[PDB]
Amino acid sequence: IVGGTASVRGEWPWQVTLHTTSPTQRHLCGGSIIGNQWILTAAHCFYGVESPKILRVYSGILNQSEIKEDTSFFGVQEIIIHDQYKMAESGYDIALLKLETTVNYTDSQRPISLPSKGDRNVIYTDCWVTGWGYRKLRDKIQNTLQKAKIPLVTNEECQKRYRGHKITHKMICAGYREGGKDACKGDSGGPLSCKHNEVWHLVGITSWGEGCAQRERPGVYTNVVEYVDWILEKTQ
Ligand SMILES: COC1=C(c2cc(Cl)ccc2C#N)CC(=O)N([C@@H](C[C@@H]2CCCCO2)C(=O)Nc2ccc(C(=O)O)cc2)C1
Numbered sequence: 001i002v003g004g005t006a007s008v009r010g011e012w013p014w015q016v017t018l019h020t021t022s023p024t025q026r027h028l029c030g031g032s033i034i035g036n037q038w039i040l041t042a043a044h045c046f047y048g049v050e051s052p053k054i055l056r057v058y059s060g061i062l063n064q065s066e067i068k069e070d071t072s073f074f075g076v077q078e079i080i081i082h083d084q085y086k087m088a089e090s091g092y093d094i095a096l097l098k099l100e101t102t103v104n105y106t107d108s109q110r111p112i113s114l115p116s117k118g119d120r121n122v123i124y125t126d127c128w129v130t131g132w133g134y135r136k137l138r139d140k141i142q143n144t145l146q147k148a149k150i151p152l153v154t155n156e157e158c159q160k161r162y163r164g165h166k167i168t169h170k171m172i173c174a175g176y177r178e179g180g181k182d183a184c185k186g187d188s189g190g191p192l193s194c195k196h197n198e199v200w201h202l203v204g205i206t207s208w209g210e211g212c213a214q215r216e217r218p219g220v221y222t223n224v225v226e227y228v229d230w231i232l233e234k235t236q
Helices: 156-160 223-236
Strands: 014-018 028-037 038-041 055-058 078-083 095-099 129-130 145-148 171-174 189-194 199-208 219-223
Touching: 014 171, 028 189, 028 199, 028 223, 038 199, 038 223, 055 095, 078 129, 095 223, 129 199, 156 171, 171 199, 199 223, 219 223
Parallel strands: none
Antiparallel strands: 014 028, 014 055, 028 038, 038 095, 078 095, 129 145, 129 189, 171 219, 189 199, 199 219
């Protein structure tokens, strides 16, 4: 996250860190708890991942340095990548992880709602991107989960900034005209969370940008509302 601030324990309880276990153990991607055995994340995360055997999902994490040999995590039973996914910038950048056991909900780990039936035309004005990603394009994964408030931009504006790409209705963009706050490397798969009527909803999944926090270059997110039927079908 560029231009963000440190989060505190319990602030973003749906946020997880997905680790790979081989050839080293490290953060791969963010994700969001959406049900008792379900993480919503980005399909791009699994490039070159041979099987679910090498994944671990850690919930209730503020600092990556909390993760030690005795830290509890969830195994991954199944990776469900959208059938149409090919490349982040071409869309369909969505995946589910089915966990090997159920998450017990606590102050530090809880699900986030999807965008609700009846809210298709809600104007979201309180949206936050979170993650352990870089603070600028050339950096490293951060220890403490970061947050930044980012305004949504229209698809029409977003398409004007990315004339080499097809910005579809299945994407949503967010950024400041003069840049300075954005997702960056290591934030992908995590949430763009928007609060409406004091309820948080998972509006986006951090997907791609051509840079981080550049002027007139909004971040591009998977538009979760356009995948609710897919998510419900896959999760039962
Ligand atoms: C290209 O745009 C991407 C991001 C992005 C998103 C927004 Cl909204 C706005 C701008 C950007 C940008 N830059 C965010 C994002 O995290 N990715 C990802 C893409 C990769 C592809 C392989 C599988 C993991 O994900 C990524 O760069 N992740 C990564 C990189 C390095 C490390 C590390 O040093 O340990 C760990 C994770 C890319």
